[PDB]
Design a protein around this nucleic acid. Structure first.
Ligand SMILES: [Mg+2]
Ligand SMILES: [Mg+2]
Ligand SMILES: [Mg+2]
Ligand SMILES: [Mg+2]
Ligand SMILES: [Mg+2]
Ligand SMILES: [Mg+2]
Ligand SMILES: [Mg+2]
Ligand SMILES: [Mg+2]
Ligand SMILES: [Mg+2]
Ligand SMILES: [Mg+2]
Ligand SMILES: [Mg+2]
Ligand SMILES: [Mg+2]
Ligand SMILES: [Mg+2]
Ligand SMILES: [Mg+2]
Ligand SMILES: [Mg+2]
Ligand SMILES: [Mg+2]
Ligand SMILES: [Mg+2]
Ligand SMILES: [Mg+2]
Ligand SMILES: [Mg+2]
Ligand SMILES: [Mg+2]
Ligand SMILES: [Mg+2]
Ligand SMILES: [Mg+2]
Ligand SMILES: [Mg+2]
Ligand SMILES: [Mg+2]
Ligand SMILES: [Mg+2]
Ligand SMILES: [Mg+2]
Ligand SMILES: [Mg+2]
Ligand SMILES: [Mg+2]
Ligand SMILES: [Mg+2]
Ligand SMILES: [Mg+2]
Ligand SMILES: [Mg+2]
Ligand SMILES: [Mg+2]
Ligand SMILES: [Mg+2]
Ligand SMILES: [Mg+2]
Ligand SMILES: [Mg+2]
Ligand SMILES: [Mg+2]
Ligand SMILES: [Mg+2]
Ligand SMILES: [Mg+2]
Ligand SMILES: [Mg+2]
Ligand SMILES: [Mg+2]
Ligand SMILES: [Mg+2]
Ligand SMILES: [Mg+2]
Ligand SMILES: [Mg+2]
Ligand SMILES: [Mg+2]
Ligand SMILES: [Mg+2]
Lengths: 27, 201, 117, 144, 64
RNA sequence: UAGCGGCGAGCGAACGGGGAGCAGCCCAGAGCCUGAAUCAGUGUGUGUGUUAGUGGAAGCGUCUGGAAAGGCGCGCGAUACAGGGUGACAGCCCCGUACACAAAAAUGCACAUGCUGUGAGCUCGAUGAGUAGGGCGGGACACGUGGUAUCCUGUCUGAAUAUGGGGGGACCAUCCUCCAAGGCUAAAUACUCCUGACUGACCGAUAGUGAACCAGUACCGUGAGGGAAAGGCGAAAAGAACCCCGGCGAGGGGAGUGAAAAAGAACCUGAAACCGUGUACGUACAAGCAGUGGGAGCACGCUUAGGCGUGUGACUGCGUACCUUUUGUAUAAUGGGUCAGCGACUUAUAUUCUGUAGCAAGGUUAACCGAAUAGGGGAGCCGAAGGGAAACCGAGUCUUAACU
């Protein structure tokens, strides 16, 4: 019921939460 | 070339190169196609991705997200996107050479003679502009689907023939190959024969 | 213009999905899997029209070799007997006689032994 | 002869290629383009005369000559064009009236090509030797 | 629209009677005291465009 | 094309020709005759529109069917068979259409005319100075400073003035042509916020405007701004009285309406993915792209029992998905959860080639006119001759003093 905002821009990933789980060993 | 007349049962001398030519079907088909392409109005358009109401902003960033790359919401692969090769109003008229147009008319008048679909009368008039009078005259002629070409301007005949869809009335100048084919019988005034022979040598 | 393709794509998918009856799972339900499974079935059918002719000849030969060794001669001695006696009976018919009419197979064996002796 | 009895000539209408509509058409996924080139790209291809970065032939080779403005206002005339005029006299204004040489033309030669039969007076034009012999044989009188 | 002529090729080539193109030879513009006179004498006259490079010429010169 | 051009990429005329349309005037100044043309304004009158409207032809019977406009008969109208609606497809049921008319009042446009203002014509003159031109620096001309004409001017200068001056693509001479440094001017031309009529080999609800629906809305964003989804009961609500279970529920079963309720408002048709119930067969000692070839048995139909079909498939031979990319993939390389819908070699103009058709040493028109896909229009374009840088020569020509 007026239930939008589910997968619109997936801000889910616009969060872009910091990656690179301290693995700069692959250098 | 001699054309026997329906009503007075006389003859009429015509040019054999005009009314006895062999039927060149590929020429006639080319002219009939170009006539029907000339009738074509060609009024349409769709919207490209340039012309769709929208914004030129990327719906999401290029990388990092898990989704496919996208640059525009106006993309022709989206719902309510543009058409990829959206059409424009275009002109479908073809060129027909003058000698090819006359070759086709001289061909199909030779074929209507050979198929006995051509009727020659001296005069074809209706006194008062009444479709009842015209339908009576065509019933006496045993005609239903007919083209009536007349070398003059008869207004009562035009009005009495305007409501009948089986019947069309032309001037001898305003004749066309697709009508000469689409109608079952063709009635020519002997004067209209003289004018057609003069235009067509 | 604007050809709308629902009717055509439906009948085209249903032609495949009818061919995929009996298959397990999505192979009988899902066009992407069924078409991928129908093609393999046509490949196997083309192959096994060739392998049918191998496998039955192999079955016939093994039955002739059994019935001939029951009558005291090998297969390879028995075919050479029938070549030297000119008997042009193919080994479908020899397997059928070896099953249903053992007397006629015995007579063929004795013809082959007399053709070698 | 009806509108549903007409048919074109054989070989007149050819169908035309439709790329990217299946394996059986031949023009399959790539459509005559190969794989992973510049030519296969949309709008791809190199311009005219591009030989790679090698110096193209139209720049290896030197320029030569110039353009004569007088050549644009000179013309050559067949002998078969001499009958197409009226009056039996041939000038520049007569040939321009006959729509042979064009308006801006100021000089013309007559060349032995085709043949003339009627006697034709030629006036104010250069004439070759063979055209002079053919005109004088047909009764002409070359003057100025 | 009309095709535009490559104007350098229009300054370098001329169409002949049978459709071939004539052109001037190269190597006759400078540094001429070390070249033999036989070489220069065989470089003064115009030559025909070869069959291999005639396609790029026709593509550059559509209006003959 | 001529030209311009790191002479590259590319830019790209003009003269001239065919057409549409055509219109010329005034002040730099005095007089003479004086209000004379025209224009403007303002009235009136007439006509024609516009802003409401009016009339407008002609059909019955029977069959099927819920319903006739349909079928089958028999008529009639038509200057009206454009179109739309009506319980299924209506020339004659309705609204209209053709045609014929119509405005108290306002207003446009034409003429005509009144009034106001305006000046007309003739003669003799005058003939646009910090201007033209120049130097420097830039820009525009197709023309990128080049040998660069012409135009504009930021800066510094600076003429003659009809016996004079400008241009004719450096420049000079001759000749031709024109008169700058003051102005005005209709038409052909460009466009469509908007209105009316009509049309479409344009779409038919993921299409077409973003929007067929209370859409630039809901919603998001501080804001500029972004920006949706969502159509259809039936001919007519006749939209389910009443009864029953249930919470004075929801929901359902009747009954009733209706042609139809597997049209009941979560409402035309209702596919697939997906999830169930029922029936048949198979399956709990059996190893893998799940099929294919063989094949027992079981169940079910037909049949003259002949045995065929149909479903299942014990056991058994063989058998490592598809796409893409690759020297090469079962590959533990990419891609795809599935279904349904959409989704990619087009269009325009030039050009070459092939085919085909027309005419043929000729072929063909464009603009435009034209009521008009005709016909006219041959301006032009290609071709029938080439060679040469070119003048030029010409079935030859160029090279060269000249070619065996
Ligand atoms: Mg931006
Ligand atoms: Mg759209
Ligand atoms: Mg024409
Ligand atoms: Mg299924
Ligand atoms: Mg690829
Ligand atoms: Mg490669
Ligand atoms: Mg390639
Ligand atoms: Mg692109
Ligand atoms: Mg290099
Ligand atoms: Mg001409
Ligand atoms: Mg030099
Ligand atoms: Mg009325
Ligand atoms: Mg009426
Ligand atoms: Mg009704
Ligand atoms: Mg119905
Ligand atoms: Mg002046
Ligand atoms: Mg100046
Ligand atoms: Mg100067
Ligand atoms: Mg300057
Ligand atoms: Mg100055
Ligand atoms: Mg000047
Ligand atoms: Mg000059
Ligand atoms: Mg002036
Ligand atoms: Mg929409
Ligand atoms: Mg729908
Ligand atoms: Mg939308
Ligand atoms: Mg807000
Ligand atoms: Mg209830
Ligand atoms: Mg319905
Ligand atoms: Mg439904
Ligand atoms: Mg279903
Ligand atoms: Mg068991
Ligand atoms: Mg078991
Ligand atoms: Mg297992
Ligand atoms: Mg089998
Ligand atoms: Mg892939
Ligand atoms: Mg490869
Ligand atoms: Mg590799
Ligand atoms: Mg392998
Ligand atoms: Mg694996
Ligand atoms: Mg993989
Ligand atoms: Mg890779
Ligand atoms: Mg994946
Ligand atoms: Mg082509
Ligand atoms: Mg052709």
């Amino acid at each position: 019921m007026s239930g939008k905002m589910t997968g619109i821009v997936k801000w889910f990933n616009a969060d872009k939460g910091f990656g690179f789980i301290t693995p700069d060993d692959g250098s | 070339m001699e054309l026997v007349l329906k009503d007075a049962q006389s003859a009429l001398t015509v040019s054999e190169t005009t009314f006895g030519r062999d039927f060149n079907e590929a020429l006639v088909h080319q002219v009939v196609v170009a006539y029907a392409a000339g009738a074509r109005q060609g009024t349409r358009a769709q919207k490209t991705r340039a012309e769709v109401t929208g914004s030129g902003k990327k719906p999401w960033r290029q990388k990092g997200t898990g989704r496919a790359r996208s640059g525009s919401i106006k993309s022709p692969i989206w719902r309510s996107g543009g058409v990829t090769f959206a059409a424009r109003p275009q002109d479908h008229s073809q060129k027909v050479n003058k000698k090819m147009y006359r070759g086709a008319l001289k061909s199909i008048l030779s074929e209507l003679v050979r198929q006995d679909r051509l009727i020659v009368v001296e005069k074809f008039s209706v006194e008062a502009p009444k479709t009842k009078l015209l339908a009576q005259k065509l019933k006496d002629m045993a005609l239903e689907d007919v083209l009536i070409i007349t070398g003059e301007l008869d207004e009562n005949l035009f009005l009495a023939a305007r409501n009948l869809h089986k019947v069309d009335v032309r001037d001898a100048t305003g004749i066309d190959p697709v009508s000469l084919i689409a109608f079952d019988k063709v009635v020519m005034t002997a004067d209209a024969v003289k004018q057609v022979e003069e235009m067509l040598a | 213009a604007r050809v709308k393709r629902g009717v055509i794509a439906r009948a085209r998918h249903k032609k495949i999905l009818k061919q995929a009856k009996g298959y397990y799972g999505a192979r009988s339900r899902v066009y992407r899997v069924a078409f991928q499974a129908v093609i393999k079935a046509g490949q196997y059918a083309y192959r096994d029209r060739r392998q049918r002719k191998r496998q039955f000849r192999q079955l016939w030969i093994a039955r002739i070799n059994a019935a001939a060794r029951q009558n005291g001669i090998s297969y390879s001695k028995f075919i050479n007997g029938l070549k030297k006696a000119s008997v042009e009976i193919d080994r479908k018919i020899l397997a059928d006689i070896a099953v249903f009419d053992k007397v006629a197979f015995t007579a063929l064996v004795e013809k082959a032994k007399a053709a070698l002796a | 002869m009806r509108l549903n009895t007409l048919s074109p000539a054989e070989g007149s209408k050819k169908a035309g290629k439709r790329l990217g509509r299946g394996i059986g058409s031949g023009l399959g996924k790539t459509g005559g383009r190969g794989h992973k080139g510049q030519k296969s790209r949309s709008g791809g291809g190199v311009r005219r005369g591009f030989e790679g970065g090698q110096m193209p032939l139209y720049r290896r080779l030197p320029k030569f000559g110039f353009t004569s403005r007088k050549a644009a206002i000179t013309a050559e005339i067949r002998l078969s064009d001499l009958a197409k005029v009226e009056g039996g006299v041939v000038d520049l204004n007569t040939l321009k009236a006959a729509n042979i040489i064009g308006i801006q033309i100021e000089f013309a030669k007559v060349i032995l090509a085709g043949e003339v039969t009627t006697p034709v007076t030629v006036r104010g034009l250069r004439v070759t030797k063979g055209a002079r012999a053919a005109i004088e044989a047909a009764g002409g009188k070359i003057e100025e | 629209p009309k095709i535009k002529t490559v104007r350098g090729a229009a300054k370098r080539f001329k169409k002949t009677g049978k459709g071939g193109f004539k052109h001037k030879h190269a190597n006759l513009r400078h540094i001429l005291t070390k070249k033999a006179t036989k070489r220069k004498r065989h470089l003064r006259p115009k030559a025909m465009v070869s069959k291999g490079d005639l396609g790029l010429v026709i593509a550059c010169l559509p209006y003959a």
